[PDB]
Amino acid sequence: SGFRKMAFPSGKVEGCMVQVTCGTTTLNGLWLDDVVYCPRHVICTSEDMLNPNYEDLLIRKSNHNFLVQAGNVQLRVIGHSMQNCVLKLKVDTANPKTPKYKFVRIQPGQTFSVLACYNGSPSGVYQCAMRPNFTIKGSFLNGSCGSVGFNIDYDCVSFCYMHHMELPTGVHAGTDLEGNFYGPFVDRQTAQAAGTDTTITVNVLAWLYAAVINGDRWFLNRFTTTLNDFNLVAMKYNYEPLTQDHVDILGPLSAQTGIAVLDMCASLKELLQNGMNGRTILGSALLEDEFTPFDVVRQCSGVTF
Amino acid sequence: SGFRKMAFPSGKVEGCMVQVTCGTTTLNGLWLDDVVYCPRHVICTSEDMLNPNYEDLLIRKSNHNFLVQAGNVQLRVIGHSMQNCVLKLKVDTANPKTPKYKFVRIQPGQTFSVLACYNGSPSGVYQCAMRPNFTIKGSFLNGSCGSVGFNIDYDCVSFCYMHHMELPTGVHAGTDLEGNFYGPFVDRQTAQAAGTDTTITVNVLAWLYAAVINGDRWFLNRFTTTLNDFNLVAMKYNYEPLTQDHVDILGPLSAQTGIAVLDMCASLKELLQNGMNGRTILGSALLEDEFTPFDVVRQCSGVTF
Ligand SMILES: NCc1ccc(-c2ccccc2)nc1
Ligand code: NA
């Protein structure tokens, strides 16, 4: 039993973290095979942060301008190229700790584990979710850029995020491992504002399903709801609209617990108007939205309590 | 910016997880040097678990009765002994991935990272706290027995916990790596109840200091109090008594934020008597008590390993 915000074991990602230094800037890089991936803004200088011409800044760089350090070994860069907002530094040595990996671009509401690193060495691991406004609520300090988000289904590490910058609201923005930013952000220090954040409704519903599997039912009710009537109420609480895709995805959890998806939706509608009245669900006085339907099936049992 | 429940990087511990099989029971083991540590109830049949005489059953078992799988290569057992509630299996090969490590026993209210494994394969990591009733609110399923809790200080991994059993309330109980149980529990199928848990007061204050560091300041007030007067309030809301060493431990956080510990206790006292008044603190509608003062300092400073 129990339900914790679990992260994937970070071992396969720790063996890939290095330190990339260009000029006076030092951040982290991801060492896969013979390529080191890092944010391209490592080549920015102090006055190249508001409107950096990355193509112009990169054409002035030679291979020996990039100091790559894996632990205490110093990797020699034998080539470099830019792909969107990430730098790809070709190195002399293939990382022998390179795992079964691949690059995937996730969608809002998806979860992943973050390995917060500084100066190339890992500091901690926690779980995140791509917010609907394409930001993530992470734990990043100065020098954390280059830290990567990932999922480890089976024995394959699916890299889906690389940290680039922190917005003024304290949230974080980054790119996939191909350099394409999540959301309408750019790697410039001009003041950018993340869109208004909404609650990931499909994740909340799955999380309520996780509570029923673990033996908690106080929040259910005898009512149902149409899909449209639910969204009309949910948007008044800043909730992401619930689509037929989400209803389908919740099917297996619905079949396991015996509660129809729209019945769980009516219980959520009631929870939003009543609160929890001094009670908790799975150990929290808020409605958690960082557990996907996929996360619930993996973490929870196959037999309901 | 940002504050997440962060776990230590599990890389150094992942390389020590093996699968231990005795008969039909298969659980996880910790492979350090040429010894595999695992719960002693692995030798127990479901029939023996009701009232087992562990030494009586261990003499009948032998080295060959213990199948230890490290990844997908077989380990040969050359000896077996018992220390308290954990089984020590002498194996023919020293683990080349054995990191710098210690065996330590933690106090209640101290936090640690848990690497949940199944069939010797780590599947998740999360941050726990040793509850004042000596249980832990983990997330464990069938086969997770032998999952270990650990901390890291520099390059040394202090093993502090090994999972043994689940309590009927969904919480979990286990031993240190020397076989000494945490709390008034035994490794046998009998009626065992977790005592009425309390809230770790020093951790709440630490988590409140972490909220102030991240700009969450609405709960601060002009008032202070005494250690006497607060401990009365703490006793009435089932909070652990705040000691003088608890305040000294919070010393650095009091100077960094300019908020005295008894000044913060007044804020926590008002938060206990009046609630959060519809607001949240670090994205929580509850008073989080699973961040030690060190955990706050470490996450708000970027200590790596
Ligand atoms: N208000 C300052 C500012 C300047 C530029 C941008 C921007 C965002 C996305 C793409 C291109 C430019 N946003 C805000
Ligand atoms: Na105060």
mmCIF file of N, CA and C in Angstrom, chain A residues 15-95:
data_model
loop_
_atom_site.group_PDB
_atom_site.id
_atom_site.type_symbol
_atom_site.label_atom_id
_atom_site.label_comp_id
_atom_site.label_asym_id
_atom_site.label_seq_id
_atom_site.Cartn_x
_atom_site.Cartn_y
_atom_site.Cartn_z
ATOM 1 N N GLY A 15 25.453 8.369 -14.514
ATOM 2 C CA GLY A 15 26.583 8.017 -15.345
ATOM 3 C C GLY A 15 26.719 8.812 -16.627
ATOM 4 N N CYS A 16 25.755 9.676 -16.953
ATOM 5 C CA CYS A 16 25.827 10.483 -18.164
ATOM 6 C C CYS A 16 26.061 11.961 -17.898
ATOM 7 N N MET A 17 26.067 12.386 -16.638
ATOM 8 C CA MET A 17 26.189 13.801 -16.313
ATOM 9 C C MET A 17 27.647 14.237 -16.334
ATOM 10 N N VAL A 18 27.915 15.345 -17.019
ATOM 11 C CA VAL A 18 29.235 15.944 -17.081
ATOM 12 C C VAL A 18 29.098 17.439 -16.814
ATOM 13 N N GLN A 19 30.240 18.115 -16.760
ATOM 14 C CA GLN A 19 30.311 19.555 -16.565
ATOM 15 C C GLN A 19 30.836 20.201 -17.839
ATOM 16 N N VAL A 20 30.101 21.181 -18.352
ATOM 17 C CA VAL A 20 30.481 21.904 -19.560
ATOM 18 C C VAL A 20 30.793 23.340 -19.169
ATOM 19 N N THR A 21 32.002 23.792 -19.494
ATOM 20 C CA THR A 21 32.444 25.149 -19.203
ATOM 21 C C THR A 21 32.844 25.840 -20.498
ATOM 22 N N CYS A 22 32.273 27.020 -20.734
ATOM 23 C CA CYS A 22 32.634 27.860 -21.868
ATOM 24 C C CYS A 22 32.810 29.280 -21.358
ATOM 25 N N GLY A 23 34.024 29.809 -21.475
ATOM 26 C CA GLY A 23 34.321 31.112 -20.915
ATOM 27 C C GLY A 23 34.269 31.094 -19.402
ATOM 28 N N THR A 24 33.395 31.909 -18.820
ATOM 29 C CA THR A 24 33.182 31.923 -17.380
ATOM 30 C C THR A 24 31.898 31.215 -16.969
ATOM 31 N N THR A 25 31.130 30.706 -17.930
ATOM 32 C CA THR A 25 29.876 30.021 -17.651
ATOM 33 C C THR A 25 30.109 28.522 -17.502
ATOM 34 N N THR A 26 29.492 27.940 -16.477
ATOM 35 C CA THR A 26 29.615 26.517 -16.181
ATOM 36 C C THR A 26 28.229 25.957 -15.901
ATOM 37 N N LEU A 27 27.834 24.943 -16.665
ATOM 38 C CA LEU A 27 26.564 24.257 -16.466
ATOM 39 C C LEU A 27 26.785 22.769 -16.715
ATOM 40 N N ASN A 28 25.698 22.004 -16.709
ATOM 41 C CA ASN A 28 25.764 20.559 -16.863
ATOM 42 C C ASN A 28 25.498 20.152 -18.308
ATOM 43 N N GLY A 29 26.025 18.993 -18.678
ATOM 44 C CA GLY A 29 25.768 18.428 -19.989
ATOM 45 C C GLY A 29 25.466 16.949 -19.881
ATOM 46 N N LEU A 30 24.745 16.442 -20.877
ATOM 47 C CA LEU A 30 24.345 15.040 -20.921
ATOM 48 C C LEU A 30 25.233 14.304 -21.917
ATOM 49 N N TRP A 31 25.989 13.330 -21.421
ATOM 50 C CA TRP A 31 26.983 12.616 -22.218
ATOM 51 C C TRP A 31 26.389 11.279 -22.640
ATOM 52 N N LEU A 32 25.976 11.194 -23.900
ATOM 53 C CA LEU A 32 25.437 9.972 -24.482
ATOM 54 C C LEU A 32 26.285 9.605 -25.688
ATOM 55 N N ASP A 33 26.758 8.358 -25.718
ATOM 56 C CA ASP A 33 27.694 7.912 -26.742
ATOM 57 C C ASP A 33 28.882 8.866 -26.786
ATOM 58 N N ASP A 34 29.153 9.458 -27.949
ATOM 59 C CA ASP A 34 30.253 10.401 -28.092
ATOM 60 C C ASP A 34 29.771 11.838 -28.272
ATOM 61 N N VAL A 35 28.562 12.150 -27.809
ATOM 62 C CA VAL A 35 27.989 13.486 -27.914
ATOM 63 C C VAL A 35 27.641 13.982 -26.518
ATOM 64 N N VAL A 36 27.936 15.253 -26.257
ATOM 65 C CA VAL A 36 27.566 15.914 -25.009
ATOM 66 C C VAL A 36 26.515 16.968 -25.331
ATOM 67 N N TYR A 37 25.322 16.803 -24.769
ATOM 68 C CA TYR A 37 24.215 17.726 -24.981
ATOM 69 C C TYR A 37 24.148 18.706 -23.819
ATOM 70 N N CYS A 38 24.046 19.992 -24.133
ATOM 71 C CA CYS A 38 23.933 21.021 -23.111
ATOM 72 C C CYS A 38 23.171 22.201 -23.711
ATOM 73 N N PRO A 39 22.626 23.077 -22.865
ATOM 74 C CA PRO A 39 21.948 24.265 -23.409
ATOM 75 C C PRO A 39 22.931 25.150 -24.154
ATOM 76 N N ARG A 40 22.471 25.705 -25.276
ATOM 77 C CA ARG A 40 23.353 26.518 -26.101
ATOM 78 C C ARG A 40 23.733 27.830 -25.430
ATOM 79 N N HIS A 41 22.944 28.304 -24.457
ATOM 80 C CA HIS A 41 23.294 29.585 -23.842
ATOM 81 C C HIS A 41 24.556 29.509 -22.956
ATOM 82 N N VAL A 42 25.248 28.366 -22.909
ATOM 83 C CA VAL A 42 26.554 28.310 -22.264
ATOM 84 C C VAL A 42 27.571 29.167 -23.006
ATOM 85 N N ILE A 43 27.347 29.423 -24.301
ATOM 86 C CA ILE A 43 28.255 30.259 -25.080
ATOM 87 C C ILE A 43 27.913 31.742 -24.991
ATOM 88 N N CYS A 44 26.917 32.122 -24.193
ATOM 89 C CA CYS A 44 26.609 33.532 -24.010
ATOM 90 C C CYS A 44 27.576 34.178 -23.028
ATOM 91 N N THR A 45 27.900 35.440 -23.286
ATOM 92 C CA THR A 45 28.647 36.257 -22.348
ATOM 93 C C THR A 45 27.667 37.105 -21.538
ATOM 94 N N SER A 46 28.211 38.007 -20.717
ATOM 95 C CA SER A 46 27.368 38.779 -19.807
ATOM 96 C C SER A 46 26.390 39.664 -20.569
ATOM 97 N N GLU A 47 26.834 40.255 -21.674
ATOM 98 C CA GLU A 47 25.994 41.124 -22.487
ATOM 99 C C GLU A 47 25.329 40.389 -23.647
ATOM 100 N N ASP A 48 25.446 39.065 -23.703
ATOM 101 C CA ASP A 48 24.799 38.248 -24.725
ATOM 102 C C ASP A 48 23.652 37.439 -24.131
ATOM 103 N N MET A 49 22.860 38.059 -23.256
ATOM 104 C CA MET A 49 21.769 37.345 -22.608
ATOM 105 C C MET A 49 20.385 37.821 -23.018
ATOM 106 N N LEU A 50 20.246 39.062 -23.483
ATOM 107 C CA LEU A 50 18.933 39.563 -23.873
ATOM 108 C C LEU A 50 18.611 39.249 -25.329
ATOM 109 N N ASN A 51 19.562 39.474 -26.232
ATOM 110 C CA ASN A 51 19.380 39.173 -27.653
ATOM 111 C C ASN A 51 20.655 38.549 -28.199
ATOM 112 N N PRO A 52 20.965 37.320 -27.781
ATOM 113 C CA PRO A 52 22.175 36.657 -28.284
ATOM 114 C C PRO A 52 21.952 36.120 -29.691
ATOM 115 N N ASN A 53 22.906 36.394 -30.575
ATOM 116 C CA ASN A 53 22.925 35.785 -31.901
ATOM 117 C C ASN A 53 23.725 34.498 -31.767
ATOM 118 N N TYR A 54 23.013 33.395 -31.530
ATOM 119 C CA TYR A 54 23.683 32.139 -31.209
ATOM 120 C C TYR A 54 24.507 31.634 -32.384
ATOM 121 N N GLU A 55 23.997 31.795 -33.607
ATOM 122 C CA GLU A 55 24.767 31.399 -34.781
ATOM 123 C C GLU A 55 26.064 32.194 -34.874
ATOM 124 N N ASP A 56 26.008 33.490 -34.558
ATOM 125 C CA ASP A 56 27.208 34.317 -34.615
ATOM 126 C C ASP A 56 28.156 33.992 -33.469
ATOM 127 N N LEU A 57 27.611 33.722 -32.281
ATOM 128 C CA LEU A 57 28.449 33.376 -31.139
ATOM 129 C C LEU A 57 29.111 32.015 -31.316
ATOM 130 N N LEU A 58 28.431 31.074 -31.972
ATOM 131 C CA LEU A 58 28.975 29.729 -32.112
ATOM 132 C C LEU A 58 30.029 29.641 -33.207
ATOM 133 N N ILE A 59 29.887 30.426 -34.280
ATOM 134 C CA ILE A 59 30.868 30.375 -35.358
ATOM 135 C C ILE A 59 32.219 30.919 -34.913
ATOM 136 N N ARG A 60 32.260 31.674 -33.817
ATOM 137 C CA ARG A 60 33.502 32.201 -33.270
ATOM 138 C C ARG A 60 34.172 31.247 -32.290
ATOM 139 N N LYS A 61 33.578 30.086 -32.042
ATOM 140 C CA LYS A 61 34.087 29.132 -31.068
ATOM 141 C C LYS A 61 34.840 28.009 -31.763
ATOM 142 N N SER A 62 36.000 27.665 -31.219
ATOM 143 C CA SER A 62 36.731 26.475 -31.624
ATOM 144 C C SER A 62 36.493 25.358 -30.612
ATOM 145 N N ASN A 63 36.902 24.145 -30.994
ATOM 146 C CA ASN A 63 36.631 22.977 -30.161
ATOM 147 C C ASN A 63 37.280 23.103 -28.788
ATOM 148 N N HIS A 64 38.489 23.662 -28.726
ATOM 149 C CA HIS A 64 39.188 23.770 -27.449
ATOM 150 C C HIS A 64 38.613 24.851 -26.541
ATOM 151 N N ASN A 65 37.633 25.626 -27.004
ATOM 152 C CA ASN A 65 36.964 26.589 -26.139
ATOM 153 C C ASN A 65 35.986 25.932 -25.174
ATOM 154 N N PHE A 66 35.623 24.676 -25.408
ATOM 155 C CA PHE A 66 34.668 23.961 -24.573
ATOM 156 C C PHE A 66 35.425 23.019 -23.646
ATOM 157 N N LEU A 67 35.325 23.266 -22.341
ATOM 158 C CA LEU A 67 35.926 22.409 -21.324
ATOM 159 C C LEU A 67 34.864 21.438 -20.823
ATOM 160 N N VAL A 68 34.976 20.177 -21.228
ATOM 161 C CA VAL A 68 34.082 19.118 -20.778
ATOM 162 C C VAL A 68 34.826 18.269 -19.759
ATOM 163 N N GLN A 69 34.201 18.046 -18.605
ATOM 164 C CA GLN A 69 34.832 17.348 -17.490
ATOM 165 C C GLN A 69 33.866 16.296 -16.964
ATOM 166 N N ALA A 70 34.226 15.025 -17.125
ATOM 167 C CA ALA A 70 33.447 13.903 -16.604
ATOM 168 C C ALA A 70 34.141 13.416 -15.338
ATOM 169 N N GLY A 71 33.619 13.825 -14.184
ATOM 170 C CA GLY A 71 34.292 13.567 -12.928
ATOM 171 C C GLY A 71 35.580 14.359 -12.842
ATOM 172 N N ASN A 72 36.719 13.669 -12.921
ATOM 173 C CA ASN A 72 38.007 14.335 -13.036
ATOM 174 C C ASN A 72 38.645 14.179 -14.407
ATOM 175 N N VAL A 73 38.158 13.247 -15.226
ATOM 176 C CA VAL A 73 38.648 13.112 -16.590
ATOM 177 C C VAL A 73 38.149 14.285 -17.422
ATOM 178 N N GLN A 74 39.021 14.812 -18.278
ATOM 179 C CA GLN A 74 38.692 15.938 -19.144
ATOM 180 C C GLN A 74 38.486 15.410 -20.559
ATOM 181 N N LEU A 75 37.254 15.496 -21.047
ATOM 182 C CA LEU A 75 36.950 15.064 -22.403
ATOM 183 C C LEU A 75 37.450 16.098 -23.407
ATOM 184 N N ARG A 76 37.952 15.617 -24.540
ATOM 185 C CA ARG A 76 38.415 16.475 -25.624
ATOM 186 C C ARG A 76 37.310 16.598 -26.664
ATOM 187 N N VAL A 77 36.887 17.831 -26.932
ATOM 188 C CA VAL A 77 35.854 18.091 -27.930
ATOM 189 C C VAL A 77 36.495 18.056 -29.311
ATOM 190 N N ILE A 78 35.960 17.216 -30.193
ATOM 191 C CA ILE A 78 36.466 17.072 -31.552
ATOM 192 C C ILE A 78 35.466 17.581 -32.581
ATOM 193 N N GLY A 79 34.450 18.317 -32.145
ATOM 194 C CA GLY A 79 33.427 18.819 -33.037
ATOM 195 C C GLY A 79 32.233 19.346 -32.271
ATOM 196 N N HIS A 80 31.494 20.276 -32.869
ATOM 197 C CA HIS A 80 30.351 20.876 -32.201
ATOM 198 C C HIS A 80 29.358 21.362 -33.244
ATOM 199 N N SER A 81 28.074 21.204 -32.938
ATOM 200 C CA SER A 81 27.012 21.678 -33.808
ATOM 201 C C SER A 81 25.822 22.075 -32.949
ATOM 202 N N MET A 82 25.023 22.999 -33.468
ATOM 203 C CA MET A 82 23.834 23.472 -32.780
ATOM 204 C C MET A 82 22.589 22.867 -33.414
ATOM 205 N N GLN A 83 21.666 22.419 -32.567
ATOM 206 C CA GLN A 83 20.362 21.917 -32.998
ATOM 207 C C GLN A 83 19.308 22.637 -32.165
ATOM 208 N N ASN A 84 18.664 23.638 -32.761
ATOM 209 C CA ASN A 84 17.669 24.476 -32.084
ATOM 210 C C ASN A 84 18.349 25.127 -30.885
ATOM 211 N N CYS A 85 17.928 24.857 -29.650
ATOM 212 C CA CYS A 85 18.468 25.541 -28.481
ATOM 213 C C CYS A 85 19.410 24.678 -27.652
ATOM 214 N N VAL A 86 19.886 23.556 -28.185
ATOM 215 C CA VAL A 86 20.857 22.737 -27.470
ATOM 216 C C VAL A 86 22.138 22.669 -28.287
ATOM 217 N N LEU A 87 23.259 22.609 -27.576
ATOM 218 C CA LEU A 87 24.569 22.387 -28.169
ATOM 219 C C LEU A 87 24.903 20.903 -28.111
ATOM 220 N N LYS A 88 25.508 20.393 -29.180
ATOM 221 C CA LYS A 88 25.914 18.990 -29.257
ATOM 222 C C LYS A 88 27.422 18.951 -29.486
ATOM 223 N N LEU A 89 28.172 18.675 -28.421
ATOM 224 C CA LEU A 89 29.631 18.683 -28.456
ATOM 225 C C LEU A 89 30.126 17.265 -28.699
ATOM 226 N N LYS A 90 30.701 17.040 -29.877
ATOM 227 C CA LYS A 90 31.322 15.761 -30.187
ATOM 228 C C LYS A 90 32.610 15.607 -29.385
ATOM 229 N N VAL A 91 32.749 14.481 -28.686
ATOM 230 C CA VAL A 91 33.893 14.238 -27.818
ATOM 231 C C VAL A 91 34.684 13.045 -28.348
ATOM 232 N N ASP A 92 35.907 12.888 -27.827
ATOM 233 C CA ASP A 92 36.792 11.825 -28.296
ATOM 234 C C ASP A 92 36.380 10.448 -27.789
ATOM 235 N N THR A 93 35.695 10.380 -26.650
ATOM 236 C CA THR A 93 35.401 9.123 -25.977
ATOM 237 C C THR A 93 33.899 8.898 -25.938
ATOM 238 N N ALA A 94 33.476 7.692 -26.297
ATOM 239 C CA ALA A 94 32.092 7.293 -26.097
ATOM 240 C C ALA A 94 31.880 6.941 -24.630
ATOM 241 N N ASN A 95 30.807 7.465 -24.043
ATOM 242 C CA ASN A 95 30.500 7.209 -22.642
ATOM 243 C C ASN A 95 30.243 5.722 -22.435
#
